[PDB]
């Protein structure tokens with residue numbers, strides 16, 4: 001029924017709004033650390049960065065739990081979905097926080113890093129691809145509810161590997177897909193290609209994430225210690 005789809009759009013939208021501060025509500029602020037030029041790794045910047053990443057992973061687990069039916073999946077499956085889509089979601093998130101004129105990305109506490117800093121923070125040689133994905137996202141002009149539904153679709157995916165009940169996850173995802181097309185089309189009738197464009201972003205995102213995981217391998221050798229436990233949880237996927 002439509003009321004249910006509408007209900008689903010509102011829930012997800014709020015789940016997302018409540019776990020991911022919009023950019024325009026963020027009290028932006030800066031740092032003067034290695035803004036100068038690129039280097040292998042600025043350890044102060046990496047600490048702040050990984051600390052923010054850890055918190056966003058928890059926020060993501062929170063978001064997932066507010067998605068109808070997630071909590072009804074086996075705990076093994078829930079964990080399986082989180083490990084598999086978490087990096088993808090992190091990517092879509094800072095990328096949706098891109099500011100083209102300043103060429104910066106803003107983290108959840110308002111920390112705004114310029115391209116050199118994101119590099120020094122840890123993205124290293126993957127920075128420009130990240131910024132390139134961010135840029136190629138702007139044309140879509142997705143709103144909060146669309147980014148939330150899309151992240152929900154990235155997460156609830158029955159094609160994951162250790163799924164115990166992949167069929168249950170597919171059925172959970174189904175309404176999310178309906179929700180996104182209905183909403184995307186309603187908000188913009190004149191742009192029929194938005195739904196499929198957004199769906200194709202999922203595949204790109206997954207592409208930048210595998211690269212990001214590979215970036216983590218190298219990163220591990222640059223840091224004078226182990227990466228935060230929640231981040232490692234995510235990387236062991």
Ligand SMILES: CC1=C(/C=C/C(C)=C\C=C\C(C)=C\C(=O)O)C(C)(C)CCC1
Nearest residue numbers: 052053056090091094107108123212216
């Ligand atoms: C965590 C992490 C990585 C990527 C993080 C990304 C792609 C986004 C983080 C977004 C945050 C932290 C957003 C916010 O706070 O709003 C890379 C692949 C460099 C490897 C080391 C661990």
